[PDB]
Amino acid sequence: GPEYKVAILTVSDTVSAGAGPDRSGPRAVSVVDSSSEKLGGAKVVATAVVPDEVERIKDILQKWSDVDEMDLILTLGGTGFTPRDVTPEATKKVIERETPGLLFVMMQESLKITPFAMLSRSAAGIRGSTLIINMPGNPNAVAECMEALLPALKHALKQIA
Amino acid sequence: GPEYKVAILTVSDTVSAGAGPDRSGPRAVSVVDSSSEKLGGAKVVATAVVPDEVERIKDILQKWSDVDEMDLILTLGGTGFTPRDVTPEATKKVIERETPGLLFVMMQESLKITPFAMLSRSAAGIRGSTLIINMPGNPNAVAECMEALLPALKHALKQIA
Amino acid sequence: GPEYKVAILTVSDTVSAGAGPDRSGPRAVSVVDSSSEKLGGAKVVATAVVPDEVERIKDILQKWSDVDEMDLILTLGGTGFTPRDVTPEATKKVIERETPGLLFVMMQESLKITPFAMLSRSAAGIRGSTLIINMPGNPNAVAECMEALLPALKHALKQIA
Ligand SMILES: Nc1nc2c(c(=O)[nH]1)N[C@H]1C(S)=C(S)[C@@H](COP(=O)(O)O)O[C@H]1N2
Ligand SMILES: Nc1nc2c(c(=O)[nH]1)N[C@H]1C(S)=C(S)[C@@H](COP(=O)(O)O)O[C@H]1N2
Ligand SMILES: Nc1nc2c(c(=O)[nH]1)N[C@H]1C(S)=C(S)[C@@H](COP(=O)(O)O)O[C@H]1N2
Ligand SMILES: [Cu+]
Ligand SMILES: [Cu+]
Numbered sequence A, B, C: 001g002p003e004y005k006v007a008i009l010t011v012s013d014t015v016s017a018g019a020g021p022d023r024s025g026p027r028a029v030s031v032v033d034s035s036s037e038k039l040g041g042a043k044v045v046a047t048a049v050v051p052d053e054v055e056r057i058k059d060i061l062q063k064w065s066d067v068d069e070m071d072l073i074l075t076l077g078g079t080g081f082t083p084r085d086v087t088p089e090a091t092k093k094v095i096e097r098e099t100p101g102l103l104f105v106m107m108q109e110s111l112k113i114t115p116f117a118m119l120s121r122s123a124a125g126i127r128g129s130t131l132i133i134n135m136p137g138n139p140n141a142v143a144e145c146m147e148a149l150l151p152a153l154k155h156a157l158k159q160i161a
């Protein structure tokens, strides 16, 4: 396996219900893969889809961190202002140590692209030796957020181990 | 009534005691009114003044969100570093979901005007279908903070419904 | 004594164990001293070193705030992503009121220097009449963070009294 095991969680009632395909997940996998060396040897080893339900989100984040030994979890979607956007709230429950600088960089860089970046309520932090980062559900958002992180994310992953 | 009901809470021991007039409140109303179309049809339907007392602030934020069906609450003042500045602490108690990107944009844009922007401890978030945003008590601050939000605030209000 | 009493806490297992010298502490003292007038009359009156242990950090922050009447506490180190970096978590337990704008400015300015700024998880806030600010353990980091704060830090200290 890879130096760093990455898992991608798509959070979406629509995808989870089989009402539409996942358009964000593949973009996230592609960005991680294509940045594998810049990330210190990262590979996406697992994906999953959950609905916009705090308990479902918490359960997968806990399992992937505590049991499956993932190193990086990216979540996609559920960070906006609608009532069903609960990804940050689930995330804040599971993380042990907050990582606000990652949020800062994502926001700073995303705002250069679109003012609608301000509507992302993404959270991020560390549980055990797993880094968890919320990204927006727009496919273009993940690539932009990863580019913002890439200069330091390899070192984040080194440090958490 | 309007598409979006806005309420403005001035937080000030001085104004509340009748020791001075409200100079921030009218500026906040003026900025919202003059931006009504950019905001998707917003109108200020109510104002109030409370002292720098956490319970008084909490009570009005809860009433306006839970009973009076306000869509946007702007608070003015009580965000600084003095012992009596408790607006953020009251706000954090009543919000259900944090909206850090709004804080980011307000800070980012305010710092371009004055380094004293860093002394604002404003909070923001959603309770029910009510968006609550703390702004500084300086009259010039509200206009600057609203300009920072205006590119996306209409969509924030659409989403929370 | 000075108008403002400053205390500097170096947080480091290595320094605390006598395994290396403190290289950050002296730089922090030097930056405060050399900025004493810009800070409104600040002087570093005390330093200490603690290990990367939440209880040890909490205890000194509480003592310096509650008993020793310090006005500004700068902590150095323990803000990164390694398991032993627990300074922010200790800090969040002791502060009463968060001061996110200080964190914003430090991050914003630090990112101009190095992308590794995003790996700082520094916290900051007020306890009583004591302002507490976490800075990174890199000696160059303290100078850069203080320069970012200096335009408004005197007024922060005036306000907290
Ligand atoms: N980099 C980046 N960030 C972004 C976007 C984007 O296109 N690029 N879309 C925004 C929009 S349009 C919103 S509504 C929020 C929240 O999205 P979410 O609910 O899908 O997670 O993310 C914002 N963040
Ligand atoms: N945009 C903007 N933000 C601003 C200001 C301003 O003039 N414009 N004044 C600052 C000052 S001088 C302080 S002390 C804090 C806190 O103000 P408050 O306590 O009145 O809420 O807001 C800051 N934020
Ligand atoms: N201004 C500034 N901030 C900075 C740095 C710096 O050199 N200058 N170093 C960074 C690095 S390399 C990391 S790993 C984090 C955390 O450092 P800490 O664990 O020593 O506190 O701070 C970051 N913040
Ligand atoms: Cu959107
Ligand atoms: Cu001020």
Ligand SMILES: [Cu+]
Residues within 6 Å of the ligand: C116, C119
């Ligand atoms: Cu580092």
